[PDB]
Amino acid sequence: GPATKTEKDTLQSALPVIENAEKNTVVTKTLVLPKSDDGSQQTQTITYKDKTFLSLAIQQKRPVSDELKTYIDQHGVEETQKALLEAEEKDKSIIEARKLAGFKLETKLLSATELQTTTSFDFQVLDVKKASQLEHLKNIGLENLLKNEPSKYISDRLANGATEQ
């Protein structure tokens, strides 16, 4: 009915010829998850190097809500980003998260109507047992991630509606 396409790519260079070397193998997968319910989306970042999860992050991309529209009416987008970041320093659930020496959260206002977030776990120093329980950090499958390979479930994601980058 419709039809479909593909592309390709392939690089060309010479051999490695250098006097320095880095045993610093770090990959990053970046799973393009589908939409959310409707109008909200997110990704899945996956850091690994052997058979195990070194770090995991969950981006976020959606429109705002009418609470924040009220602030944006009064002030403007110029002030609104600042107010969002400050909303994080006073969120007790974010404070409870930020005790972990392997948790990070960034939030930004992408437009007068639009906001990003991203939540990173550093499984070298993230206290999984606590990151499994922190209100925000309940709804995730923290423990359910660790019980299989960093790669096994990437296949299961594309099998569950997902895509890659």
**Strand order across the beta sheet in which 103-111 lies:** 27-31, 44-48, 53-63, 114-121, 103-111
Distance CA 140, CA 21 (A): 38
Distance CA 135, CA 137 (A): 5
Residue 45 dihedral angles phi and psi, to the nearest 5°: -95, 140
Distance CA 62, CA 109 (A): 10
**Alpha carbon 135 to chain centroid, angstroms:** 18
Task: List the determination method.
Answer: NMR
**Alpha carbon 130 to chain centroid, angstroms:** 19
Collect all residues with Cβ–Cβ distance below 8 Å to 87 and sequence separation of at least 6.
107
Token duo for residue 15: 């051999």
The residue ranges of every structural domain in the chain are: 25-165
* SS3 track for 24-72: CCCEEEEEECCECCCCCECCEEEEECCCCEEEEEEEEEEECCHHHHHHH
Distance CA 77, CA 108 (A): 11
Collect all residues with Cβ–Cβ distance below 8 Å to 108 and sequence separation of at least 6.
81, 84, 85, 115, 116, 117
Q: Which residues pair with 59 in a beta bridge?
A: 118
**Alpha carbon 37 to chain centroid, angstroms:** 18
| Sign of torsion over alpha carbons 162, 163, 164, 165 | negative
Among 53, 52, 47, which Cα is nearest to 31's?
Answer: 47
Supply angle C-alpha 82, 41, 97, rounded to 5.
55
Q: Which residues pair with 27 in a beta bridge?
A: 48
Q: How many CB atoms lie within 10 A of CB 23?
A: 4
Distance CA 125, CA 127 (A): 6
Cβ distance 121 to 101 under 8 Å? no
Collect all residues with Cβ–Cβ distance below 8 Å to 97 and sequence separation of at least 6.
103, 105, 131, 134, 136, 137
Cβ distance 66 to 60 under 8 Å? no
Among 158, 153, 160, 165, which Cα is nearest to 51's?
Answer: 153
Q: Which helix (H) or strand (E) holds 120?
A: strand 114-121
